[model samples]
Target chain A: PQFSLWKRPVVTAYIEGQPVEVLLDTGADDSIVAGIELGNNYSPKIVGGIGGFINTLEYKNVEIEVLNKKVRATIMTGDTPINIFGRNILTALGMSLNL
Target chain B: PQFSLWKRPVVTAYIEGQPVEVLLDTGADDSIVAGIELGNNYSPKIVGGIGGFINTLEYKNVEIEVLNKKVRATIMTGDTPINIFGRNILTALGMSLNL
Candidate 1:
């Protein structure tokens, strides 16, 4: 299907062993995941959001599958409804913005 | 040559007769240009950024080019080091996120 820029890109990926909808954003410096237990395998992180709010995040190395590929992606977890993946994993998985 | 998600997409264009580097960001809600006053053709607007700060910007009906395509783009001006184009212009230019 032809992708829509207005709709953005949504990837169906697994995080913390659960299937979730994630927004693949190239502008994002790091990835963010929501509503899951990333477990005791990370450190506390604080991320400032575009909405002027601080997102409490944690950094973890976990497996995230996108474009039929699996990666041991490192992401920041926050209190969000959706997950976000940055270029770190996108490039690591050999994906580009294709400008 | 291929695009680099790490380096992002940089487009060189003439903004009020000055050459500049622009970072193409899919995550940005609107386009913003730096160091240009954009006098008399705009009003003050503020936007929130992921870094948790409010950016003061001004709007304008200006021309921007990418991929060697010309577009009379509408953008915001701010006290930033560079210019940023959002999905608004990207979609208008017949571009997609291509997930």
Candidate 2:
């Protein structure tokens, strides 16, 4: 998968077999999603985001399909407008930022 | 230039011919810096970030060197921990996010 730098790196992804918009955030260490329930069990956590730190719920071993690959990810909970694919999942996919 | 997705895409860059650290952020629409005055005059603006919207000062035509190239960028002022290289300058350099 390749994304243009001139645009917000938003791509269509599948979560629980449902389509969702995901932001490829190189600055984020952990991936996050909004308005979705991954599981009944989750843990409270805090993470540093773009504007500041945010309170989130950590859901482990979630699966999301993007760029033709079904990736296992640690999806956190947040009140963001879009879902984020951050370094954790990005690293597992062996992704890179290039010029 | 290339960066590993497991880590923050931070690289050494030159601003005003001085060394500074820059985070290559695909989620950010505009570039931002902290504790640096690009100019005396700037306009107040609000931008959506990871946690939420933030107030910042917009500066124009600022030059920063990264990946051995001097790129003109719209540098914004905020109270962030680090400087961000956003889509505006990333597009100018023809950068991409890949997997």
Candidate 3:
């Protein structure tokens, strides 16, 4: 059996009064907030898979908005490209490919 | 004493017969090759820092060609944006920013 991979466009959301843009990754399994910059209300109680070698932290079950659609999902913390939209979040929202 | 952070331009290089683009991260401490796509001559060795909570593995002291300048450096494995050009590589080459 062949498995399918899905790709989607992601947007950046800023937590109120924060300078960081919460990257919305569609390929991720949960929502992540910046470990270093996480706000007071947000605590480091979540855990997720770490990247292969980069050791970037992955966070799950955080709140975010994509394409003006408010939703909760996983996010990875890093100063790199900001955020990534992985498959997990896409599957939950019943999103289909536009391409 | 105040420390300064420097940023510079980065370019991507593809390993021989491989499609992956080695990101030049100036912030990285060592050079890296893709763990998944590493060539036969390259073996996974040298360990370094992992991001805060992310499990991404960080590789060090791998041979990479940057800006047409061939040099050995560290690279982390992942499928994110690409290779990042970090300060270690910049300091090794004695590069100064134009900005």
Candidate 4:
């Protein structure tokens, strides 16, 4: 019940050269970008979260900017209002939470 | 399509000074320790995951060891198989994902 933004995990990512704050969710199995205008691609997939399912427009080998560094990421567009980064591309980039 | 642990982000922690491997899930809002017995507390919460929900026994002011550092964290005991460290304690330790 205590849902406050004071201590949420967010990361800065540039999609199509536009800066967007995305949630870094290790629990999410796939990456989904919502409300972002990305050129349509093939390999459509359905991403599911804790509550429900989301139909995704898959984009392969897409280039994204993260941490001020350019990296190729596999992203999908969904109907969500927020963009979430999953482990698919995160693991490849050797990303880990430092405590 | 590829689900492998070749490069998954994992960390080691001591639950009651016992080493336990945990997944640092930014996606998980709360921490759930499965299969670990802890002294009972008052708070009881149900944690929701990508697919379903798990009943949790909340413990406050629990001392845990991470990266050889001692920290007091609010944790929950669940019936699942894997132990997860969520943002509740992660943020308290000033944790962040690094590339």
lDDT of 2 by residue, A67-97 (tens): 8888888888887666888889889877998
Task: Candidate 1: give the clashing pairs.
Answer: A50-B49, A50-B50
Q: What is the TM-score of chain B alone in each candidate?
A: 0.78, 0.87, 0.51, 0.82
Rank by lDDT, highest first.
2, 4, 1, 3
Question: Going through the candidates in order, what is the number of backbone clashes in each?
Answer: 2, 0, 51, 0
Q: lDDT by residue for model 4 over B1-99, one digit each (tens)?
A: 112323555778887877788876766667877666677664888766443566788988888988666889888877655677877766765566555
DockQ of 3: 0.05
Candidate 2 per-residue C-alpha lDDT over B1-99 given as tens digits, one digit per residue, 9 for 90 to 100:
788876688888776766778888887778888767577778899887666777899888878878878888787888778888878878887899887
Which structure among the candidates has the greatest DockQ?
Answer: 2
Q: Rank the candidates by TM-score, best first.
A: 2, 1, 4, 3
Q: Which residue ranges in model 2 land beyond 4 Å of their true spot?
A: none
Which residue runs of candidate 1 sit more than 4 Å off their true CA positions? A47-58, A79-82, B51-55, B79-82
lDDT per residue, candidate 1, A1-99, as tens digits? 335567667778887568888876766668887777777767677765444444555565687777777888788767665567877777777766544
Q: Chain B TM-score of model 3, please? A: 0.51
TM-score of 2: 0.92
List ranges where model 4 is wrong by over 4 Å. Answer: A1-7, A12-14, A17-20, A26-29, A35-40, A44-57, A78-82, A91-96, B1-6, B17-19, B79-81
State TM-scores per candidate: 0.79, 0.92, 0.34, 0.69
Off by over 4 Å in 3: A1-99, B1-10, B16-24, B30-36, B39-52, B57-60
| DockQ ranking of the models | 2, 1, 4, 3
What's the true lDDT of residue A82 in model 1?
52
Number of the candidate with higher TM-score, 1 or 4? 1
lDDT of 3 by residue, B8-90 (tens): 12345654334345433322444444445553453344343233332245545656554556656555554344444444555
Backbone clashes, candidate 2? 0
